[PDB]
Design an enzyme around this catalytic site. Structure first.
Site, PDB file in Angstrom:
ATOM      1  CB  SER A  43      -8.461  -0.537  -5.082  1.00  0.00           C
ATOM      2  OG  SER A  43      -7.655   0.544  -5.520  1.00  0.00           O
ATOM      3  CE  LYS A  46      -8.311   0.396  -9.201  1.00  0.00           C
ATOM      4  NZ  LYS A  46      -7.234   0.470  -8.281  1.00  0.00           N
ATOM      5  CB  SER A 103      -5.219  -3.037  -7.940  1.00  0.00           C
ATOM      6  OG  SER A 103      -6.033  -2.207  -7.171  1.00  0.00           O
ATOM      7  CB  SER A 210      -4.236  -1.010   0.724  1.00  0.00           C
ATOM      8  OG  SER A 210      -3.509  -0.782  -0.411  1.00  0.00           O
TER       9      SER A 210
END
Length: 261
Positions: A43, A46, A103, A210
């Protein structure tokens, strides 16, 4: 005990593979450890999707207030903000914020769908001079982090240079740059990662990520109290698919490379 030796020892006892790139923007000096090697971004990618939408807003004043409908069908695995708006709407600005600060995976996929696909995020990165970044899949499958798989990877050094360009440099116009920095500073997920290895009074903007193979990442812009900013990228991955994530290794690495600043 030089920095390099300390990082090698940390990697060795951890049982995985660690990648670090620190840029000190006072003199553009760098601290690098496996900074040329590919790691799954998970992530942390992003940030590039949110930045690609901010770039579009430079030439379209109404874009960030455009509304997007959130249906029950849009929810994937981890959607702490989008689930609160089911049947409702969210603006592209609210999706950017949710993707970065929580997230939220539904938020990321909506941003990608708006842009036209993961290849459009890669093309944005290339427009910034980043020749390394590649985005291939959406959430949640971009977190498989299979060893040796090039998909959805970058290198610590490329990502450190790009994050410097995005937050402190030429990549975005000022209002958009400031908005990205505001989102990163508001992150809620990084308390135990880089931030935990730094003095408590430094101001940090970061994005965690993660995934499988115990893959544990954080990318940060750091504002010391009496010094120029530092950009830090810490990536970590392990050889077993079901390995535990190790945010404490990122905190330890950040403590090692910032001893002296």
């Amino acid at each position: 005990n030089s920095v390099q030796q300390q990082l090698e020892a940390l990697e060795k006892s951890s049982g995985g593979r660690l990648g670090v790139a620190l840029i000190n923007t006072a003199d553009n000096s760098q601290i690098l450890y496996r900074a040329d090697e590919r790691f799954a971004m998970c992530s942390t990618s992003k940030v590039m999707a949110a930045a690609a939408v901010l770039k579009q807003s430079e030439s379209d004043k109404h874009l960030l207030n455009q509304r997007v409908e959130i249906k029950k069908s849009d929810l994937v695995n981890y959607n702490p903000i989008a689930e609160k708006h089911v049947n409702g709407t969210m603006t592209l600005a609210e999706l950017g914020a949710a993707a970065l600060q929580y997230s939220d995976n539904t938020a990321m996929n909506k941003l990608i769908a708006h842009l036209g696909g993961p290849d459009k995020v890669t093309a944005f990165a290339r427009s910034l001079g980043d020749e390394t970044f590649r985005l291939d899949r959406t959430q949640p499958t971009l977190n498989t982090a299979i060893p040796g798989d090039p998909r959805d990877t970058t290198t610590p050094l490329a990502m450190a240079q790009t994050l410097k360009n995005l937050t402190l440099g030429k990549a975005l116009a000022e209002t958009q740059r400031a908005q990205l920095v505001t989102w990163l500073k508001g992150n809620t997920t990084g308390s135990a990662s880089i931030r935990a290895g730094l003095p408590k009074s430094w101001v940090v903007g970061d994005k965690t990520g993660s995934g499988d193979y115990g893959t544990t990442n954080d990318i940060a812009v750091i504002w010391p109290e009496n010094h120029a900013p530092l950009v830090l990228v810490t990536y970590f991955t392990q050889p077993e698919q079901k390995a535990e994530n190790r945010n404490d290794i990122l905190a330890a690495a950040a403590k090692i490379v910032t001893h002296g600043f």
